[PDB]
Structure 1
Amino acid sequence: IAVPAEILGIILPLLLGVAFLVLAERKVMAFVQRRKGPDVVGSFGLLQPLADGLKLILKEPISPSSANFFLFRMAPVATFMLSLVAWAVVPFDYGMVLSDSNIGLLYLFAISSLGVYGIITAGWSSNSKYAFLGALRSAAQMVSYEVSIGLILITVLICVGSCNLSEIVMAQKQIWFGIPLFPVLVMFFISCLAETNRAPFDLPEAEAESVAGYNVEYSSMGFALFFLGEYANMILMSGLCTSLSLGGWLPILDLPIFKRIPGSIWFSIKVILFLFLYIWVRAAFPRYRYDQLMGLGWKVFLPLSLAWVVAVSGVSVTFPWLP
């Protein structure tokens, strides 16, 4: 019926957006670094993702024969499932949701919790022990920063009585929650940066460095699926950031000239600014050591998140400012 059509219309444009997102990351990083990104495969490099995908498809696969063939193959499948089903709930405007779950926030938190298993199984199923150690490190980092992310979600849930993203936005109608909670938004942005192993806290992508990663053993399509899952998670958490601290499909100042824009355009624009911030932070800053980032996650963001939860609860309970 219409549900498979909606699911396909969510999934395929998401893959196109991920491809153009890696292309945009290349272009923005190059323009930052006083150079030009992919410009020779199509006009302005618009066909570069297509060429890359076709090359990856046409590349002949190799079988590691690691005695864990099923677990080796299914881990990128698992993370791809997790990214897609996480994207299954995010709203885009008033009524553009597949599952209008009343517990949408906790659903996304649970899906983020499940995300470590793909990397853990990928590291274990690989023959090399370096990949296993890197997978363990990445899993632990995602664990700590997801604890921080959950505390930020609790702050937002204190601000808004409901638990579904659509009603969250409907409450965001007034002040966007970013004006009241800009430090909370900053902490959530850094936590989601460390959640997807992007920007600083980039352990798996430091392959030229001694940490190596969990994708060393993986073949063409395994690596491609892991990359697609990571970038889909990046877009997902940018959407989470804009739905939580920027009002989602809501204009600025509620002027009637701004209401001519559908609102899905507003959500897309905010997601684009968040992705630009992702690439900006990745290009502009060095990376943390594993111990440094773990101590920072467990000692800097967790106490601050707890303190902000307490402060928001105290502000809301004391005054009649409660929903």
Structure 2
Amino acid sequence: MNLNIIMTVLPLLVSVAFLTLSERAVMGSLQRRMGPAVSGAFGILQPFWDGFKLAVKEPILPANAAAGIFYAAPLICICICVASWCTLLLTDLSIGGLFLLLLSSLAVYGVLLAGYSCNSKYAFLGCLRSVSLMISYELVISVVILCVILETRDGNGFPCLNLTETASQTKIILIPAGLLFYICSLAESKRVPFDLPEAEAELVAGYNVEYSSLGFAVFFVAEYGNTLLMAALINIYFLGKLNSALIAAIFVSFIWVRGTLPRYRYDMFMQIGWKSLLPVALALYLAQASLGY
């Protein structure tokens, strides 16, 4: 193995915990409230309580479901997050960003197995709604990446999607595609404008609600980890070399845009992705494969 895996994994866990803290602190800011202050004095130590306490809660035996798949979904999310971050920071793969696109297409599985665990006729339709969102906006992300490789050329002149090489130069041409990438990244992390779940999920339509103690932790951590990976991708493609402040700022922008926006209905955001975002992304992909070489 390599020692770099540690230097990538550990910062990720710490960062996700304080991302969960940041979300509610920013909510307190919008709503003339304050960050939690009884957990400690500084508040650095708030999310660690939730994790450690969640270790404490007595386990529930699985009910009317196959055990293997129910265990499988958390492991899938935790595998995908680690692979994504360690291929964003620790690899030279010529087509690495396309590999990240592949690893984002595997996130459909975690939700889908979690839905199959329910085996409720209503839960079938709910999990299908969630995966429909994810795939529909994965298509537009794929078109935007096709746009990105088009200005991404290495010093030797070979087209590629090596993350360091797309990071090397900042292209203001690509910014029209970065707006679509930001909207789709909101869609893929199930942010409120595309958070169809919360309304459906208050009654048990079907979501990671079934998972309870440590399985439930890893899902929510993986959600924030994927959001942070999207922020890193927005930085590395469209905004130049990788900067930690820019990544966290994009995450805060996610929270702000969420707060300022209500949710969409299922047919609405699905019609947005297909009849609005996809034609514009094909028009920009034309505009980029057809702004030229």
For residues 51 and 89 of structure 1, the distance between their equivalents in structure 2, rounded to whole angstroms, comes to 30
- State the match for 2:50 in structure 1: 52
Task: Please tell me the root mean square deviation across aligned C-alpha atoms, in Å.
Answer: 1.6
Deviation per CA, 1:224-280, whole angstroms, max 9, x where unpaired? 11111111100001000000110023xxxxxxxxxxxxxxxxx10110110011100
Q: Which runs of 5+ in 2 are unaligned?
A: 154-159
* Match among 180, 196, 199 for residue 206 of structure 1: 199
Q: Is the 8 A contact 1:152 1:188 kept in 2?
A: yes
Question: Following the alignment from structure 2 to structure 1, what is the Cα–Cα distance between the partners of residues 139 and 113?
Answer: 21
User: Which residue type is aligned with residue 131 of structure 1?
Assistant: A
Separation of aligned partners in 1, 2:233 and 2:113:
27
CA spacing shift, 1:287–1:44, aligned 2, 3 Å: farther
Q: Which amino acid aligns with 2:34?
A: K
Aligned residue number for residue 231 of structure 1: 224
- Deviation, 1:212, is 3.7
- Contact 1:38-1:44 at 8 Å conserved across structures: no
How far is 1:30 from its partner? 1.1
User: Alignment identity in percent?
Assistant: 48
Question: Deviation digits for residues 42-79 of structure 1, max 9, x if unmatched?
Answer: 23421111111111101111123223111011111111
- Asked whether the 8 Å contact 1:205–1:213 carries over to 2, the reply is no
Higher helix share: 2
**Deviating 4+ runs (over 6 angstroms):** none
After superposition, the C-alpha distances for 1:288-307 in whole angstroms (9 at most, x for unaligned) are 01111111111111110000
Residue in 1 that maps onto 2:289: 313
> Retained in 1: the 8 A contact 2:65–2:118?
no
In 1, the alpha carbon distance for the partners of 2:11 and 2:24 equals: 20
Tell me which residue corresponds to 2:157: none
Alignment pair present for 1:282 and 2:277: no
What TM-score does the superposition give when structure 1 sets the normalisation length? Answer: 0.85
Alignment match, 2:41:
43
Alpha-carbon shift at residue 203 of structure 1 (Å): 2.5
Match for 1:188 among 173, 181, 184? Answer: 181
Verify the 8 A CA contact 2:148 2:174 in the aligned structure 1: no
CA distance in 1, matches of 2:64, 2:260: 39
Question: Aligned with 1:205: secondary structure?
Answer: helix
Give matches, 1:260-279, under 5 Å: 267-279=243-255
1:135/1:214 contact within 8 Å kept: yes
Aligned to 1:168: 166
CA contact (8 A) 2:111 2:207 kept: yes
Three-state SS of the structure 1 residue aligned to 2:197 is: coil
Structure 1 pair 226–206 and aligned structure 2 pair: CA distance change class (3 A):
farther
| Structure-2 residue corresponding to 1:301 | 277
Separation in 2 of the partners of 1:199 and 1:208?
A: 13
Aligned to 2:110: 118
> Secondary structure in 1 aligned to 2:196?
coil
Distance in structure 1 (CA, Å) of the matches to 2:137 and 2:204? 19
Q: Distance in 2 between matches of 1:157 and 1:134?
A: 35
Kept after mapping to 1: 8 A contact 2:167/2:237 = yes
* 1:129-187 Cα shifts (integer Å, max 9, x gaps): 443322211111000101101111110111113211011112x1xxx22x323331111
Secondary structure in structure 2 of the residue aligned to 1:237: helix
One-letter code of the match for 2:113?
T
Pairing partner for 1:128 from 120, 124, 137: 120
What is the letter of the counterpart of residue 273 of structure 1?
A
- Report what 1:240 is aligned to: 233
Q: Matches of 2:80 and 2:262 in 1, distance apart? A: 29
Q: CA deviation at 1:207?
A: 5.5
> Structure 1 stretches of 5 or more lacking a match?
91-96, 250-266, 317-321
Q: Which residue of 1 aligns with 2:208?
A: 215
Structure 1 residue 37, shift from structure 2 partner: 2.3
CA offsets 1:51-110 (integer angstroms, 9 cap, x no match) = 1111110111112322311101111111111111111122xxxxxx32211111110010
Name the CA distance, whole Å, in 2 between partners of 1:18 and 1:216: 20
The reply to whether residue 292 of structure 1 matches residue 268 of structure 2 is yes
